[PDB]
Structures are given as structure tokens and as C-alpha cells.
């Protein structure tokens, strides 16, 4: 039913056949799919008002 070959197993960042994971500085959300900041300035985010 759930596989990384279809929509990345619904993982926001990384998928492993599913178990979702995130890059350093991010933590896996309560839904087990989304990624949330785990530090004040995580990589690859714009935090100044645009």
C-alpha cells in the first residue's frame, strides 16, 4: 500500500522502505510525514520577512 516509489511514501523529505526522515536541523512531525525545525536556524529556510 505505502512505498517510496509512489509520491515518496508521502514523506516531505526522505523515505525508506515506510519510515519518513528529515535532513539535519529538522525533526519528524506528529503526523510522521512532515519535517519541522529542531534548531533556531535550520538549513535551507528563509526566516527574514519577504
Amino acid at each position: 500500500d505505502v512505498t517510496c516509489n509512489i509520491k515518496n511514501g508521502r514523506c516531505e523529505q526522505f523515505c525508506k522502505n515506510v519510515v519518513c526522515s528529515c535532513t539535519e536541523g529538522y525533526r519528524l512531525a506528529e503526523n510522521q510525514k512532515s519535517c519541522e525545525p529542531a534548531v533556531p536556524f535550520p538549513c535551507g529556510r528563509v526566516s527574514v520577512s519577504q
Binding site: 516531505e12 535532513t23 539535519e24 536556524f41 538549513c43 528563509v46 526566516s47
Partner: protein
Amino acid sequence: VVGGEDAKPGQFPWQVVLNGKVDAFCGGSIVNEKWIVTAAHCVETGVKITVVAGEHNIEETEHTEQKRNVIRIIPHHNYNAAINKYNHDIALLELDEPLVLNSYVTPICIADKEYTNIFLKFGSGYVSGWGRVFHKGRSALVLQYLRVPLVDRATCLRSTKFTIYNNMFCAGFHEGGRDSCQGDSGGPHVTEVEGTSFLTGIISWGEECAMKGKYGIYTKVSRYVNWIKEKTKL
């Protein structure tokens, strides 16, 4: 960047500018507080370089800038300028003192080899730098950015007499007009993955900037992920 737009402050907080005998000669990206990733052709001569993070307008002090001296230059072990100046075109720079991460100075994410390749294949990245805004013209004061589409290898190979190796990629437009240029090399090519940008390429080289039938050539970062993570470990 030819045909780009002025970035707003803190829009590309991973971007850095390199200065040497000529200021703003190349760009780079923050891997972490002590390390920068750039093109090896930018630092091959092993000259005294300074990095400026938190920069927006290179001729106006905005109080977000962080200058650091480079204490170590690590070109990739397969880089050899006497054989090919633009093949294996990637290098790391160690800063004398760590940067203070904030909204204007933030690292770029780097995924594993597999995911960096998947993100490149999404086919649309953002490039940025203070390079030439016209072919053979004046270089930018405000940081420029541009969305560039990925070009298939076959179209890329037909566009040049030069050799495009498999861990290089083409990006740009069929009719030119918009492209990276001299002064941008070493800077980032990033892919937005659900609001998080990942490094997918290094701005490397090209023939005429923004010419119809020619494309910008970039280094595939997926080819060097294990080397970047290893050498930059804090």
C-alpha cells in the same frame, strides 16, 4: 546573473561572496558555520581569499555581513587544472572563525547522493550571485537570482564543442536572455523541496553568457555529497 532579479535581504542566506585581488570574483554556499563549498577553479591558485556571508548590496553596509579569512582550501582530489580547469570543479574553504547563524547567515541543506539527484531531476533550480548582469558588462551591486530549467543531456551535448561529463549538467533557456555569468561561479544552484532548499549544483562555467543556443554548465553536487559531509564534519 544576466536577466535575473534583485534578491530581498535574507532571501538566499546560504550565499557568500569571495574576494581576493578582485572583489566578488566568485560565489559560494554555507555548508556549516566553519565551511563553504565553491568551484575549484575559483581557488586553484591558493591565494589569500576572504568570504562575506550575510551580504545583500556589496557597496552598502547593512549590518548583516560577516567577513572571514580562509585558513584551508580543499579542492576535490580529482581536480587538476593542468588537465581540465572545469572538470571535478568543487572545493571547500575552512573559515578562520565560525559564522554566527541567523536569518541572514543560514546553511544550505545537502541531502544524500540519491535524494540530491532526485531533487536535481525536479528540473528547476535557483541560481544566484553578484556576477555580470550583461555578457562582458558591469557586475551587480545587489545580489541577483534566477530560476533556470534543467536541459536534457542530448540538447546540452549538441550545444557545444566542449566535453560535458556525466556529473556536469546544463541549465538555462532555449533562447538565452537569462543565465549565470562570470563572477557567479562557485555559487549555488538550489532546489526548493516543500519550502526547504537543498544544494543540487555548483555554478561552474559557460561560453557566451545568455546567448541563444548556449547553456550554463554546473557541477552535480550528488557526485560529491560523501566528500562534503566527511571534510566538513564539526
